[PDB]
Assembly symmetry: D3
Amino acid sequence: AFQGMTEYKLVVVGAGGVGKSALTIQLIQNHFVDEYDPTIEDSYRKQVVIDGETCLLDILDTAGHRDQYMRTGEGFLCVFAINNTKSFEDIHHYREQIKRVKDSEDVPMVLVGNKCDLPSRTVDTKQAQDLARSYGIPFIETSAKTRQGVDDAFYTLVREIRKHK
Amino acid sequence: AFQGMTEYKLVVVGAGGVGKSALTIQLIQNHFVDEYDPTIEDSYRKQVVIDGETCLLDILDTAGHAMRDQYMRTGEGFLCVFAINNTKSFEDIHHYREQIKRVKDSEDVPMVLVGNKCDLPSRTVDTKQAQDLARSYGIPFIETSAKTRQGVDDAFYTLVREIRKHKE
Amino acid sequence: AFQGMTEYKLVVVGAGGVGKSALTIQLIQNHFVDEYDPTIEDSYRKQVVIDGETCLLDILDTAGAMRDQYMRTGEGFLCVFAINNTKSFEDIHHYREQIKRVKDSEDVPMVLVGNKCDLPSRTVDTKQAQDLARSYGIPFIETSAKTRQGVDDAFYTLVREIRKHKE
Amino acid sequence: AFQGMTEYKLVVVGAGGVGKSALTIQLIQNHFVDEYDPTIEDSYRKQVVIDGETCLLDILDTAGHERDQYMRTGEGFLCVFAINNTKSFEDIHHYREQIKRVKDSEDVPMVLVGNKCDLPSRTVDTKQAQDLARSYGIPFIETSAKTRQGVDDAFYTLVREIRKHKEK
Amino acid sequence: AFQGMTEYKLVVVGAGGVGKSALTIQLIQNHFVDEYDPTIEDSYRKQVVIDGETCLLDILDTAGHEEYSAMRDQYMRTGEGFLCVFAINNTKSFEDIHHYREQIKRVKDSEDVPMVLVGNKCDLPSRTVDTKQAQDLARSYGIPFIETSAKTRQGVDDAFYTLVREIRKHKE
Amino acid sequence: AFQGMTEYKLVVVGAGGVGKSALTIQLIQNHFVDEYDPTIEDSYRKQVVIDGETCLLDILDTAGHEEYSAMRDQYMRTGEGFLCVFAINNTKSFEDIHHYREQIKRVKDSEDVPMVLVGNKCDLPSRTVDTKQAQDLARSYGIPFIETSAKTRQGVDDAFYTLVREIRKHKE
Ligand SMILES: Nc1nc2c(ncn2[C@@H]2O[C@H](COP(=O)(O)OP(=O)(O)NP(=O)(O)O)[C@@H](O)[C@H]2O)c(=O)[nH]1
Ligand SMILES: Nc1nc2c(ncn2[C@@H]2O[C@H](COP(=O)(O)OP(=O)(O)NP(=O)(O)O)[C@@H](O)[C@H]2O)c(=O)[nH]1
Ligand SMILES: Nc1nc2c(ncn2[C@@H]2O[C@H](COP(=O)(O)OP(=O)(O)NP(=O)(O)O)[C@@H](O)[C@H]2O)c(=O)[nH]1
Ligand SMILES: Nc1nc2c(ncn2[C@@H]2O[C@H](COP(=O)(O)OP(=O)(O)NP(=O)(O)O)[C@@H](O)[C@H]2O)c(=O)[nH]1
Ligand SMILES: Nc1nc2c(ncn2[C@@H]2O[C@H](COP(=O)(O)OP(=O)(O)NP(=O)(O)O)[C@@H](O)[C@H]2O)c(=O)[nH]1
Ligand SMILES: Nc1nc2c(ncn2[C@@H]2O[C@H](COP(=O)(O)OP(=O)(O)NP(=O)(O)O)[C@@H](O)[C@H]2O)c(=O)[nH]1
Ligand SMILES: COc1cc(-c2cccc3c2OCCO3)ccc1Nc1cccc(CN(C)C)c1
Ligand SMILES: COc1cc(-c2cccc3c2OCCO3)ccc1Nc1cccc(CN(C)C)c1
Ligand SMILES: COc1cc(-c2cccc3c2OCCO3)ccc1Nc1cccc(CN(C)C)c1
Ligand SMILES: COc1cc(-c2cccc3c2OCCO3)ccc1Nc1cccc(CN(C)C)c1
Ligand SMILES: [Mg+2]
Ligand SMILES: [Mg+2]
Ligand SMILES: [Mg+2]
Ligand SMILES: [Mg+2]
Ligand SMILES: [Mg+2]
Ligand SMILES: [Mg+2]
């Protein structure tokens, strides 16, 4: 018996202020949050259709500065801001922490370069694509403000989870 | 901030063979199950719109006969099911209602009375009797058939409305 | 890469006047057709969600070598009789045989449908129809195009049978 | 030019107690109302897809015994009788006449609805009702607000009749 | 008894040529109107789900400059919520916002009317109104501010959905 | 009797690398394709609601450069509407639009074919084709013009939905 639609547990990680909450809230509520209210832990849920399969996204929005939610997640959005080189260098640390806690090389993951609407770009697309090619994962540019790439990022993660299953 | 649609935990209880599973599967899959496969415990989930609110129904299908006390404490609302061709199942209703009230330590638990198999000609429980039982408990009564689908949506949607009323 | 929803080809067969068209029109338009207008061939399409998969049902409504054509094309068959017509129930065996010959296979996705279950003049017992279906290895469903009982179930069950046969 | 989905104003008329409200509430809420609470005037709204066109149904549920206002506003009328009440069937002629006078027209979109077709106490034969409907040039549908039989069909058929009357 | 989904009456106001119609048509039809066809009065309707509640938006698209003022006072009395739109490349339209807000407050005889400030045409390069200025104006009124572009669709849903949330808050 | 939703056959044409596949994939999967995988012929399908009518879009994604093919002329005769795509940073692709339009008119033997002009890659800073120029070209052909970006998703839905509206107009 089918017992209800497929459920995917997604976790959004990355440095303080890169736009993890803004991305998530733009997905769930179609709203851009302008304030910076630091997060402890928040949970969201949304039903969507991706490639003709109905599914339920459970989304965990994490704090910038834990082992529990890394063990629960099936897929991770690894977010940096394209105007903050430090947040991009930190990506390697988030990826390592996820791999240790799940004890696995092959974890579904997507690299997300957020704030692509800002004119102060310090991380080149080619650099981020290279980093992603080296990890074997997709890369997507987003803006929580304009909504560019937001759906794509979360839907691409879902496709990665499907492939890994 | 809204964090996702409202979730309702529904538990279907009643005697062996009244059609608890058949009702639930007819709601989830639009399928009538003809076989009688006795249930231990099964969990289902469905998104629906009731009175303009989108919600997620988590539905626990229970066995006819401490794991029991667990799900009674978790559930927010109960479908109490009997079969209209089985007078025993109708008399047992009062026992299920009492067990739920003891475990939740409450008089006012959201509940709906469901008289299933209303498509069968061998009726032994009168509608008026069942309506009286329900009036005495202060809860709605609905006749259903998992076979024809009559009243199935109504039963589960009415339960959700009862849960909403109890939360104001 | 996903390029659009999955499509399923369903064929409704059975004797004249059992309610093949009435069933189909009740599925597509939520309308009971009271008139009996005999069919040559009609095609319908509907999008639905079954078990969380969005799909497109292409439905061929048949008449009571153009016949061999649609048997080769269909992935699944609703075999319909009327519960008040014993002849239509005996004819089921003939439709099933013709389908198995044309597809050269024992295991073709199929559902047995006993229609007009709202009428009081029942001449085919449920148990008999269930036995026939158990012998063929296929599901049996009672329907009424008039009350709508079992209509969705019949078509959706057929789609599930097609899915099982494709794994 | 498109400003939002097409809107249809439907009016449900007929004698007291034939099930005008029960039909409407079964359409809107998937709920059978067992109590008889007489209506003054109630308004309902539902978005549906009929023949691939999205539309908004505005539905006016009327009182058995009261009017000219809502007959002028309506684009289509469900004329309801109960199949176990011969009087309600004879009254149909009066509702149809009143509608034709107020709209000053022979060709008003209309559907004849024989409700309570789940009851065994039938006093109006289907053939009689079909003849009445054939004489008026309108469809006839048997419904039960209890089992839900024919409910969607009645309202959707009325919408199709309104569409047909507008292409000229 | 529930009788059908909740209905919200939204009114889009602001100076001539700010993009009131373009915003509305982008919401209803997913179409950018490039032509500038001045509006008299137009009505639109759309069903949407916001925060899990299904609702029906009735949307009144108004004229920049009103011919006669009684027809203006009519729709201000009917509306439950107002999108107050200026164009970020037209400082005059931004200064006019204050006047639309005042007229609405007088006609509804209330300080706390559901309202959203909308800075439209944020895709254009000739920006003359700074974001910070508009945010300050909105903070002073106690209402949300959203940047939109009817062309790119940025912020369009957000503007209308945020207005509905403001109406809900005012009704509790 | 209604037998199922209306079906529209749409063909996407234009020079190599303008973003015909990227547009189509962004419509179907909400995904931006960054890689450039040249197309021979690909078929897509999507159900949408446009102006309250549910429809099924059958979409044929064509090759940039193809010598004469009879198999190519086949599907151009079957197609009911054409998206004519150029890239706003490639003046050659804009000049080629005239050639696609001529080929379509010859194969359909008709002046009045439903068609939409699409200027893609409007997110790039290397613009060489002005909006006004493209609007003038489109006004001369009697067809709509839409700026799109498969990357940002701007105008994507609008392009395909506008084509469907053009097909509807041509059928009345
Ligand atoms: N322009 C622009 N600003 C953005 C974008 N995403 C987030 N912001 C802004 O960046 C700031 C921080 O966003 P926030 O969502 O709180 O980031 P965070 O990763 O969740 N922070 P934390 O780890 O403390 O929870 C906010 O002021 C927000 O409005 C974007 O894509 N574009
Ligand atoms: N005619 C008819 N038969 C029904 C209906 N509902 C259930 N049945 C039949 O009655 C039997 C029991 O159904 P089932 O759901 O297994 O009962 P249950 O309450 O789940 N039993 P248990 O407690 O063992 O899990 C099955 O044979 C089923 O087909 C109905 O509404 N009408
Ligand atoms: N009472 C009742 N009548 C039905 C039912 N199904 C079909 N009918 C009636 O039976 C007649 C035959 O229905 P129809 O669908 O035309 O049968 P068919 O199998 O398509 N005939 P054919 O093979 O000629 O195309 C119609 O008058 C219809 O109203 C049902 O489930 N209940
Ligand atoms: N068995 C059966 N009972 C029905 C049906 N429809 C309505 N009833 C019952 O008949 C009674 C009257 O129903 P109601 O909807 O109030 O009729 P009404 O035409 O609206 N009355 P009024 O004109 O005063 O507003 C109620 O007790 C209702 O439960 C039906 O289709 N089947
Ligand atoms: N680039 C760009 N142009 C826009 C935007 N919004 C509107 N326009 C353009 O600005 C012009 C005015 O738009 P319109 O919606 O008619 O404005 P209005 O506020 O309704 N005018 P009126 O008050 O007379 O009815 C049109 O040419 C339109 O295309 C936008 O967000 N970006
Ligand atoms: N920046 C930007 N790049 C785009 C856009 N659309 C397409 N591209 C890029 O342009 C390249 C070509 O895209 P594609 O859709 O394959 O072009 P095509 O017209 O289908 N090519 P062909 O005719 O050979 O099949 C890709 O690398 C793609 O990422 C856009 O709107 N913006
Ligand atoms: C919070 O989770 C539930 C909670 C309930 C629920 C409802 C009511 C009472 C309960 C419940 O669960 C714990 C004990 O008490 C029911 C279902 C679920 N969940 C669910 C969703 C989809 C599929 C499945 C099937 N599993 C077994 C593979 C399950
Ligand atoms: C692949 O085509 C079909 C195939 C089938 C189909 C199903 C099963 C077997 C078949 C079939 O086709 C011919 C013979 O073999 C049924 C429907 C269709 N298609 C269809 C699509 C939209 C609208 C309509 C209605 N027409 C009359 C405009 C039809
Ligand atoms: C209740 O009526 C409305 C009310 C309002 C409305 C909203 C807000 C304020 C108002 C309003 O009406 C008049 C003055 O004040 C807006 C729309 C409508 N209705 C509407 C819906 C879809 C399409 C059309 C256009 N037709 C006639 C072609 C109309
Ligand atoms: C007849 O259907 C089409 C028609 C067209 C179409 C559109 C435009 C022009 C055409 C067309 O086809 C015939 C020649 O001219 C395009 C797509 C389709 N259909 C479609 C789309 C996606 C997937 C499938 C199943 N297979 C291919 C995996 C089918
Ligand atoms: Mg945060
Ligand atoms: Mg069970
Ligand atoms: Mg037929
Ligand atoms: Mg009433
Ligand atoms: Mg305007
Ligand atoms: Mg390509």
